[PDB]
Symmetry: none
Protein backbone atom coordinates (compact mmCIF):
# COMPACT_ATOMS: atom_id res chain seq x y z
CA UNK A 1 0.00 0.00 0.00
CA UNK A 2 1.07 3.60 -0.69
CA UNK A 3 0.81 6.15 2.14
CA UNK A 4 1.82 9.82 2.30
CA UNK A 5 1.53 12.12 5.31
CA UNK A 6 2.33 15.83 5.16
CA UNK A 7 1.81 17.69 8.46
CA UNK A 8 3.15 21.14 9.27
CA UNK A 9 2.45 21.09 13.01
CA UNK A 10 1.52 17.85 14.78
CA UNK A 11 0.25 17.38 18.35
CA UNK A 12 -1.91 14.38 17.62
CA UNK A 13 -2.70 12.21 20.63
CA UNK A 14 -3.13 8.44 20.27
CA UNK A 15 -3.68 6.37 23.43
CA UNK A 16 -4.83 2.88 24.30
CA UNK A 17 -5.59 1.52 27.79
CA UNK A 18 -4.24 4.64 29.47
CA UNK A 19 -5.31 5.93 32.89
CA UNK A 20 -4.79 9.45 34.21
CA UNK A 21 -5.78 10.80 37.62
CA UNK A 22 -5.31 14.57 38.12
CA UNK A 23 -6.10 16.24 41.46
CA UNK A 24 -6.01 19.83 42.70
CA UNK A 25 -7.14 19.60 46.30
CA UNK A 26 -6.49 22.63 48.49
CA UNK A 27 -5.80 26.07 47.06
CA UNK A 28 -6.10 29.21 49.20
CA UNK A 29 -5.36 32.84 48.36
CA UNK A 30 -5.61 36.06 50.34
CA UNK A 31 -6.30 37.87 47.07
CA UNK A 32 -7.52 36.56 43.74
CA UNK A 33 -7.29 32.85 42.95
CA UNK A 34 -7.20 31.81 39.30
CA UNK A 35 -7.08 28.18 38.16
CA UNK A 36 -6.81 27.32 34.48
CA UNK A 37 -7.06 23.62 33.74
CA UNK A 38 -5.86 22.10 30.44
CA UNK A 39 -6.37 25.23 28.29
CA UNK A 40 -5.92 25.14 24.53
CA UNK A 41 -5.29 28.55 22.99
CA UNK A 42 -5.37 29.10 19.25
CA UNK A 43 -6.58 32.70 19.61
CA UNK A 44 -5.27 35.41 17.23
CA UNK A 45 -4.99 39.13 17.96
CA UNK A 46 -3.84 40.93 14.84
CA UNK A 47 -3.76 44.44 13.37
CA UNK A 48 -2.94 44.54 9.67
CA UNK A 49 -2.50 47.80 7.86
CA UNK A 50 -1.31 48.51 4.31
CA UNK A 51 0.16 51.87 3.30
CA UNK A 52 -0.02 53.92 6.49
CA UNK A 53 0.89 57.60 5.88
CA UNK A 54 1.53 60.24 8.57
CA UNK A 55 2.39 63.56 6.94
CA UNK A 56 2.97 66.76 8.95
CA UNK B 1 -4.57 1.01 -1.09
CA UNK B 2 -3.49 4.62 -1.73
CA UNK B 3 -3.77 7.13 1.14
CA UNK B 4 -2.76 10.80 1.35
CA UNK B 5 -3.07 13.06 4.40
CA UNK B 6 -2.27 16.77 4.30
CA UNK B 7 -2.80 18.58 7.63
CA UNK B 8 -1.46 22.02 8.49
CA UNK B 9 -2.17 21.92 12.22
CA UNK B 10 -3.10 18.65 13.95
CA UNK B 11 -4.39 18.13 17.51
CA UNK B 12 -6.54 15.14 16.73
CA UNK B 13 -7.33 12.92 19.70
CA UNK B 14 -7.75 9.16 19.29
CA UNK B 15 -8.32 7.05 22.42
CA UNK B 16 -9.46 3.54 23.24
CA UNK B 17 -10.23 2.13 26.70
CA UNK B 18 -8.88 5.22 28.44
CA UNK B 19 -9.96 6.47 31.87
CA UNK B 20 -9.45 9.97 33.24
CA UNK B 21 -10.45 11.26 36.66
CA UNK B 22 -9.99 15.03 37.22
CA UNK B 23 -10.79 16.66 40.58
CA UNK B 24 -10.71 20.22 41.88
CA UNK B 25 -11.84 19.94 45.47
CA UNK B 26 -11.21 22.94 47.70
CA UNK B 27 -10.52 26.41 46.32
CA UNK B 28 -10.83 29.51 48.50
CA UNK B 29 -10.09 33.15 47.72
CA UNK B 30 -10.34 36.35 49.74
CA UNK B 31 -11.03 38.20 46.50
CA UNK B 32 -12.24 36.94 43.15
CA UNK B 33 -12.00 33.24 42.30
CA UNK B 34 -11.90 32.26 38.64
CA UNK B 35 -11.77 28.64 37.45
CA UNK B 36 -11.49 27.83 33.75
CA UNK B 37 -11.74 24.14 32.97
CA UNK B 38 -10.53 22.67 29.65
CA UNK B 39 -11.03 25.83 27.54
CA UNK B 40 -10.58 25.80 23.77
CA UNK B 41 -9.95 29.22 22.29
CA UNK B 42 -10.02 29.83 18.55
CA UNK B 43 -11.23 33.42 18.97
CA UNK B 44 -9.92 36.16 16.63
CA UNK B 45 -9.65 39.87 17.41
CA UNK B 46 -8.49 41.72 14.32
CA UNK B 47 -8.42 45.25 12.90
CA UNK B 48 -7.59 45.40 9.21
CA UNK B 49 -7.14 48.69 7.44
CA UNK B 50 -5.94 49.45 3.91
CA UNK B 51 -4.48 52.83 2.95
CA UNK B 52 -4.66 54.84 6.16
CA UNK B 53 -3.76 58.52 5.61
CA UNK B 54 -3.13 61.13 8.34
CA UNK B 55 -2.27 64.47 6.76
CA UNK B 56 -1.70 67.64 8.81
CA UNK C 1 -9.13 2.03 -2.18
CA UNK C 2 -8.06 5.65 -2.76
CA UNK C 3 -8.35 8.12 0.15
CA UNK C 4 -7.34 11.78 0.41
CA UNK C 5 -7.66 14.00 3.49
CA UNK C 6 -6.87 17.71 3.44
CA UNK C 7 -7.41 19.48 6.79
CA UNK C 8 -6.07 22.91 7.71
CA UNK C 9 -6.79 22.75 11.44
CA UNK C 10 -7.72 19.45 13.11
CA UNK C 11 -9.02 18.88 16.66
CA UNK C 12 -11.16 15.90 15.84
CA UNK C 13 -11.96 13.64 18.77
CA UNK C 14 -12.38 9.89 18.31
CA UNK C 15 -12.95 7.73 21.40
CA UNK C 16 -14.09 4.20 22.17
CA UNK C 17 -14.86 2.75 25.62
CA UNK C 18 -13.53 5.82 27.39
CA UNK C 19 -14.61 7.01 30.84
CA UNK C 20 -14.11 10.49 32.26
CA UNK C 21 -15.12 11.74 35.70
CA UNK C 22 -14.66 15.49 36.31
CA UNK C 23 -15.48 17.08 39.70
CA UNK C 24 -15.40 20.63 41.04
CA UNK C 25 -16.55 20.29 44.63
CA UNK C 26 -15.92 23.26 46.90
CA UNK C 27 -15.23 26.74 45.58
CA UNK C 28 -15.55 29.81 47.80
CA UNK C 29 -14.81 33.47 47.07
CA UNK C 30 -15.08 36.63 49.14
CA UNK C 31 -15.76 38.53 45.92
CA UNK C 32 -16.96 37.32 42.55
CA UNK C 33 -16.71 33.63 41.65
CA UNK C 34 -16.60 32.70 37.97
CA UNK C 35 -16.47 29.10 36.73
CA UNK C 36 -16.18 28.35 33.03
CA UNK C 37 -16.42 24.67 32.19
CA UNK C 38 -15.20 23.24 28.85
CA UNK C 39 -15.70 26.43 26.78
CA UNK C 40 -15.23 26.45 23.02
CA UNK C 41 -14.60 29.90 21.59
CA UNK C 42 -14.67 30.56 17.86
CA UNK C 43 -15.88 34.15 18.32
CA UNK C 44 -14.57 36.92 16.03
CA UNK C 45 -14.30 40.62 16.86
CA UNK C 46 -13.14 42.52 13.80
CA UNK C 47 -13.07 46.06 12.43
CA UNK C 48 -12.23 46.27 8.74
CA UNK C 49 -11.79 49.58 7.02
CA UNK C 50 -10.58 50.39 3.51
CA UNK C 51 -9.12 53.79 2.60
CA UNK C 52 -9.31 55.75 5.84
CA UNK C 53 -8.41 59.44 5.34
CA UNK C 54 -7.79 62.01 8.11
CA UNK C 55 -6.93 65.38 6.58
CA UNK C 56 -6.37 68.52 8.68
CA UNK D 1 -13.69 3.06 -3.26
CA UNK D 2 -12.63 6.69 -3.79
CA UNK D 3 -12.92 9.12 -0.85
CA UNK D 4 -11.92 12.78 -0.53
CA UNK D 5 -12.25 14.95 2.57
CA UNK D 6 -11.46 18.66 2.59
CA UNK D 7 -12.01 20.38 5.96
CA UNK D 8 -10.69 23.80 6.92
CA UNK D 9 -11.42 23.59 10.65
CA UNK D 10 -12.35 20.27 12.28
CA UNK D 11 -13.65 19.64 15.81
CA UNK D 12 -15.79 16.67 14.94
CA UNK D 13 -16.59 14.37 17.84
CA UNK D 14 -17.00 10.62 17.32
CA UNK D 15 -17.57 8.42 20.39
CA UNK D 16 -18.72 4.88 21.10
CA UNK D 17 -19.50 3.38 24.52
CA UNK D 18 -18.17 6.42 26.35
CA UNK D 19 -19.27 7.57 29.81
CA UNK D 20 -18.77 11.03 31.28
CA UNK D 21 -19.79 12.22 34.74
CA UNK D 22 -19.34 15.97 35.40
CA UNK D 23 -20.17 17.50 38.80
CA UNK D 24 -20.10 21.03 40.20
CA UNK D 25 -21.25 20.65 43.78
CA UNK D 26 -20.63 23.58 46.10
CA UNK D 27 -19.95 27.09 44.82
CA UNK D 28 -20.27 30.12 47.09
CA UNK D 29 -19.54 33.79 46.41
CA UNK D 30 -19.81 36.93 48.52
CA UNK D 31 -20.49 38.87 45.33
CA UNK D 32 -21.67 37.70 41.94
CA UNK D 33 -21.42 34.03 40.99
CA UNK D 34 -21.30 33.15 37.30
CA UNK D 35 -21.16 29.57 36.01
CA UNK D 36 -20.86 28.87 32.29
CA UNK D 37 -21.09 25.20 31.40
CA UNK D 38 -19.86 23.82 28.05
CA UNK D 39 -20.36 27.04 26.03
CA UNK D 40 -19.89 27.12 22.27
CA UNK D 41 -19.26 30.59 20.88
CA UNK D 42 -19.31 31.29 17.17
CA UNK D 43 -20.54 34.88 17.67
CA UNK D 44 -19.22 37.68 15.42
CA UNK D 45 -18.96 41.37 16.31
CA UNK D 46 -17.79 43.31 13.28
CA UNK D 47 -17.72 46.88 11.96
CA UNK D 48 -16.87 47.14 8.28
CA UNK D 49 -16.43 50.47 6.61
CA UNK D 50 -15.21 51.34 3.10
CA UNK D 51 -13.75 54.75 2.25
CA UNK D 52 -13.96 56.66 5.52
CA UNK D 53 -13.06 60.36 5.08
CA UNK D 54 -12.45 62.89 7.88
CA UNK D 55 -11.59 66.28 6.40
CA UNK D 56 -11.04 69.39 8.54
Amino acid sequence: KVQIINKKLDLSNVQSKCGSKDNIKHVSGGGSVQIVYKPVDLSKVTSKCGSLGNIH
